[PDB]
Structures are given as C-alpha cells and as structure tokens.
Amino acid sequence: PDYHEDIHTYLREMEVKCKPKVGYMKKQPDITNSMRAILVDWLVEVGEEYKLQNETLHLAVNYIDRFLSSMSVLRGKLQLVGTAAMLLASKFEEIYPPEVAEFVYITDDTYTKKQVLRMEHLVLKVLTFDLAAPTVNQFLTQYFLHQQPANCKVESLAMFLGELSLIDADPYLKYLPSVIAGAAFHLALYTVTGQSWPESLIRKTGYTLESLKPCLMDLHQTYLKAPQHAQQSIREKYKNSKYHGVSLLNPPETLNL
C-alpha cells in the first residue's frame, strides 16, 4: 500500500494526543496498579470467551486509562468502567459486537444493563467520542510489513509481548505505543530468529535500538518474570495453537545491547 507512510506519520501524531496522565494512579484515592492489572487480565479472559480481536482489547485499555486520568473511581465501580470500555471498543472494532446483555453477563450480574449503558454514555462524554486511538497493535501491524522473511512465530511473540505491557501501568504507561511496539518487535525478532531491529524500520520510525533500550530493558524484565506474574491470562492465551504456543518459548538471558 502507499498510504503506509502517511498513515504511520498520522498514527505517530495521534498517539501523542490520546496519551493518558502517566501518574494518574497516585492521584486515585481508591484504586491501585494491582487492581488495574486484575481488571485488564479479566478483559483478556472476556476477549477469549467472546472471541474478540486483540485490537478491541488494546482499545479498551486505552479508554480505561484515559478515563481514569480524569475521573476518580472507587473499587466497586472499576469493573463497570472496564466493562463499558470493552463494550465501546467492541462496537468500534468488531464486525458483530456482543450485545449489552452479554457484557452484563460476564460481570456476573454485578451491574445492571442500565448501569452499563449509563457508564457507556459517561465514558463517551469523558473521552469526547474520541475512540479511534492508536494502539501498540496498530504499530506492530505497520512494522510487520518491514519484516523481510515474514515469520508467524515472530509476529505471535511480538503480539504476546505487546499484550503483556497492557497489564502493568508501571512502567508501561510512560512509553508511547510506537515505542512499546518497537521493543516488542525487536525482542520477539531477537528471541525467535536472533535478528535485530531492522534498518528499514529505523528509517521508517526514526527509532534506533539505542532509543528503544529503556523500554526494551523493561519489556525484557517483564518477559523474564512472566511466569511469576500474578496475572496469567495472557500467557495462557498465547500457548494456544493459533499463537504457536510462543508464551512457552524461553526468553533470552541477555539482549546484548
């Protein structure tokens, strides 16, 4: 395609705007990073139960973080925000999104159809209908075209690494999607084929292996500790055949950067 460049440039422009407050959690009086981790991990499950696209998952997390950047939410309503976020992301990205009733069901009737629809309205208001947000997923898709020998295991592993970043607000909230995607692509490519962040993508993104280092060091740490993480839905999801069980692959000891 030849809009490829204009689009990357546009996504890079937009990712800098849909950016949530890096330190919003310290300002939340009742919720914490751990509660968020638990929430996102649950959305992954919901996604597997309803066979939703990964993009839907990424968009929902983006909505949740932006909403929490300007709205105090209490423990008991955090899931309601997350559910409405998933519902909105589904309507935006899915061909046939689950019905409200279905979203109310997976919350084990903790909330009402009414509460969920009321929250949808509020989330839309707070986000001012700006739902077409740039995601790690989108940047990974753009990078995959610059993959000389397109390798499906590399793609699955990059997806896996990118998806893991959604779980921990700290430290991923301080990195741009394009950067997280950059690290995820390199780390996956390095783990599966020993190759590194390609020259073509350096020219395309302007990111050097050096610039990705900070994020790369963090992602590698997450990759290494993945089996010990309290939240495991992503690892489980990625040991499926559709992802070539890449979550079972052993991460390299060092990145030799």
Partner: protein, 302 residues
C-alpha cells in the same frame, strides 16, 4: 444537552432511514443553518449504535473541504444528535434531475476530482468509507461535493475483516469482495468511485446487479472474466468457481462513449481487477484527465 437542543429550530425533514432522521435546522442564536441527524436510542436498547460510534469518532478526525463537517454532538437521555454543516442535495437526486440533459463533462470532472481529494484524505488518515454511492455524496450550489454518511466507515490501523454478510451496496461493490476476499482495502472505495464516475458519464449505473452472482457476472461481461494473468490469485479466492463463463473485455470506448482517451484511461485504472494494482486516490489526482479541471456550478433544481 437539553439546553443546546433548545437553541435549534427544526425547519423540515430532509431524509430518513434505519439510523433515524436527518432534519434541516437553524441555530436560533447565531442563525447558522445546519443538518441534524437524529438517532433514537430507546429503539433497540443496546446503547449508542455502532454506526454512530464510528461516524462520530472517525468523522471528527477528518477535517477536509470534501468531507461533510461534523459540527457537534448532543447526547440527551433518549436521543443522540449529530450536527453537520448543511448541503442542499445528494448526487443521486442530482443525477435523476439531470437525466434529460446529462451532467456536463466539466462538472463531472470537477466532482470526481473533489471526491478523490476527500477520499485521499480519508485513506491517508486510515479511514475506509466502504459505502460510497450517489446518495452518500453531498453537493451545494457553489459546485462543491463532499463525502458523507460514515456509518459504515472503519479505521484500518489494523486490517478490516470482511463481513460474512457484505455491507457495501451491491451495484458499487468491488469484485474482490464478491469473490470473498478476507480483508477490505482502500481499493474497494476507489472501485465504488469508478462506478460512480461512469454512471455520471453515461446516465446509467455501470453494474446494476440483481444478486451477488449477477453483480459479479455483469462485471465479467464488461471487463472480461479475470484470470491468473490479469489478477494473480483470482482462481484461488473463496467464492471463485472455475465454471465461471469466460467473457472477453468489452471495448472501453463503447462502455463510456462520451469519454476521451484520458477519461477512459483513468476509469480503467479505477476498475482494475487486482486491488493491489487498482489506482489510488492519491495517484488518480495526478492523472492527466484532471489537467484542465475547473469548478463549474450545478443547476440545482431546489
């Protein structure tokens, strides 16, 4: 919300559909004329419709002269209102009213030129229209034309999967779609524009199919039945049958008689079978056919 709505004076209903209704209205305080697309939410009790979610979110990211402008969104308890700039008429109504005399080639050129500008803008901003047809194209008395109705529009930062049950209006549906391709691409919008280009030129729809298979065959019958040479991979597509009749490509000068060499060139590039090779809106704009474009004003029989 209820306050804002009070500042609006409904003038008259100008359109309807499943989405709801489109009224012409006037801002009582500023006098600004506007178009209000009303959407009843208590109709299906499923929240804000996907079409509204997509039209609003995508359209508010597209600011261009050839794309209908979304001025505002009022979300009350039971209704959702989309406020747009106002335009006098759609291309379909205009084409009907121009049946006798036909739309002048200079104006056809102008419209196609603007449509490609708006489409190029959409595509370079990762938005696929997916439902480009005469009634979704708006025109004013100054000779401007804009893309409208982004209810089926989709962002494609991530490839857009094809609906098991296709959505693009049959007559303007691209062959890749009819043959069951996995993903949409910017090419399906260009194809629609090509069909519209020809329709304006001849005063008759280019491929008015009665069904999917009939649609497909009318295309084959005009452009020739595609083979691996013309379109690598055709024979491998889901809904492709080797038992398809093998028609020959009709002579373009007979398909769009009123067009010159340039016009025929552009249209054939827009109707190219292989979507990877079908011309882009960006490239189409550079085509020599627009060498002398101008901005004629239409005779709107308002």
């Amino acid at each position: 919300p209820l306050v804002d709505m009070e500042n609006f004076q409904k003038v008259e209903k100008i359109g309807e559909g499943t989405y709801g209704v489109v009224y012409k209205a006037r801002n009582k305080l500023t006098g600004e004329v506007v178009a209000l697309k009303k959407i009843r939410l208590d109709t299906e009790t499923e929240g804000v419709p996907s079409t509204a979610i997509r039209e609003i979110s995508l359209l508010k990211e597209l600011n261009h002269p050839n794309i209908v402008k979304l001025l505002d969104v009022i979300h009350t308890e039971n209704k959702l209102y989309l406020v747009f700039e106002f335009l006098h008429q759609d291309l379909k109504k205009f084409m009907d009213a121009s049946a006798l005399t036909g739309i002048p080639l200079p104006l056809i050129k102008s419209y196609l030129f603007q449509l490609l500008q708006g489409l190029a803008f959409c595509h370079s901003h990762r938005v696929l229209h997916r439902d480009l047809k005469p009634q979704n194209l708006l025109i004013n008395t100054e000779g401007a034309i804009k893309l409208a109705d982004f209810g089926l529009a989709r962002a494609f930062g991530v490839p857009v999967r094809t609906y098991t049950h296709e959505v693009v209006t049959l007559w303007y549906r691209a062959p890749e779609i009819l043959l069951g391709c996995k993903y949409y691409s910017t090419a399906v919008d260009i194809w629609s524009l090509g069909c519209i280009f020809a329709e304006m030129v001849t005063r008759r729809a280019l491929f008015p199919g009665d069904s999917e298979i009939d649609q497909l065959f009318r295309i084959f019958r005009t452009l020739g039945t595609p083979d691996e040479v013309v379109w690598p991979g055709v024979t491998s597509m889901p809904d492709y049958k080797p038992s398809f009749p093998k028609w020959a490509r009709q002579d373009f000068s007979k398909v769009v008689p009123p067009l010159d060499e340039d016009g025929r060139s552009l249209l054939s590039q827009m109707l190219h079978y292989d979507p990877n090779k079908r011309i882009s809106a960006k490239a189409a704009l550079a085509h020599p056919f627009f060498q002398d474009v101008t901005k004629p004003v239409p005779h709107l029989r308002l």
